Scaffold this active site. Structure first.
Site, PDB file in Angstrom:
ATOM      1  N   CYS B 105      15.675  -6.814  -6.462  1.00  0.00           N
ATOM      2  CA  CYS B 105      14.936  -6.828  -5.204  1.00  0.00           C
ATOM      3  C   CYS B 105      15.779  -7.434  -4.085  1.00  0.00           C
ATOM      4  CB  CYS B 105      13.611  -7.570  -5.357  1.00  0.00           C
ATOM      5  SG  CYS B 105      12.413  -6.997  -4.106  1.00  0.00           S
ATOM      6  N   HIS B 125      16.037  -3.893  -2.983  1.00  0.00           N
ATOM      7  CA  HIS B 125      14.841  -3.439  -2.280  1.00  0.00           C
ATOM      8  C   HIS B 125      15.266  -2.717  -1.004  1.00  0.00           C
ATOM      9  CE1 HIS B 125      10.997  -3.388  -0.147  1.00  0.00           C
ATOM     10  NE2 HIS B 125      10.444  -3.541  -1.338  1.00  0.00           N
TER      11      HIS B 125
END
Lengths: 188, 188
Positions: B105, B125
């Site tokens: 992420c 992400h």
């Protein structure tokens, strides 16, 4: 104007099944209370992750009512939930006021122990099916998430995201669920 | 004959991205140490879940070496990882000994801060892409999980299960990953 969720956390709960709904529900703006069955002290989950609850269940009981009561799974966690008289009182009250009850994996077996929602369609983890179906009091489903009346159940750690978003959709509606879902990078 | 994993836990980490790999890796028989960046005290994650680490990072540093070092995401968590000189030392040592480094992420942005793995293909992400790509030191991928050499990256909370199973497959092999996967009730 804020919805409220109670998550009941007992020793041996499946930590993924606890954190994923709590996190997702807080992303949806829901006020979540992680309540420890045995008190305010830190809870050792099934894979040894240790989580600090927001309150004891005793204290959290007094700040009701809650729009959803959430029962995580984990075999020993569900067993502790099933044996707790305080859980029985909370669940019976939630049923009487027609509030949502959500349980995942082995969690639904606490419903049977407490005689909650007989007649409803439910799912469980496959390994918990025989236990949930003792007596034929529910109808079994193999859907990843199942919702019948006020009873929402789901199957395992890998269904935790779908389980949590179904809670969001039920409380806050489909548009909020879709908005919360997009930044998570779920496949479907 | 037991593989060892270090998970570095800082204030503001994404709690789902922390618990899912820890739980799955412990299901695979890996010895996991959840080490708190600031010490042994409980860590408040991004959605207010509070987790007790197994040890301080200082203590955990001395019980190396680890077969994988795991960096969760969460924007403020990754920022704390990126600012920590102890993280820099741990990552540089892991790179030098050709150990696995796994980040999810926003976590991969700590690699850039610490000048780790330049030239590798990575994912993040979507919201962290511009930060990770400042200077063109990596090549970007939109795969849900990306592995290039000793660098394993993944995109978001919803990819946490695939991320964790890729760590298992790398450490213990494909058969153990498949065995651990089946009881989770993942879709694919």
């Amino acid at each position: 104007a804020s919805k409220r969720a109670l998550v009941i956390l007992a020793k041996g709960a499946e930590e993924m099944e606890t954190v994923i709904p709590v996190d997702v529900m807080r992303r949806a703006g829901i006020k979540v209370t992680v309540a420890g069955l045995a008190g305010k002290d830190p809870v050792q989950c099934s894979r040894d992750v240790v989580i600090c609850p927001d309150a004891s269940l005793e204290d959290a009981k007094k700040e009701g009512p809650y729009d959803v009561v959430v029962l995580p799974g984990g075999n020993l966690g569900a067993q502790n939930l099933s044996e707790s008289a305080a859980v029985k009182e909370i669940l019976k009250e939630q049923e009487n006021r027609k509030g949502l009850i959500a349980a995942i994996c082995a969690g639904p077996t606490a419903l049977l122990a407490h005689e909650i929602g007989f007649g409803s369609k439910v799912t469980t983890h496959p390994l918990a099916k025989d236990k949930m179906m003792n007596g034929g009091h529910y109808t079994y489903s193999e859907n990843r998430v199942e919702k019948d009346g006020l009873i929402l159940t789901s199957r395992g750690p890998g269904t935790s995201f779908e389980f949590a978003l179904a809670i969001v959709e039920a409380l806050n509606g489909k548009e909020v669920a879709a908005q919360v879902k997009a930044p998570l990078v779920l496949k479907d």
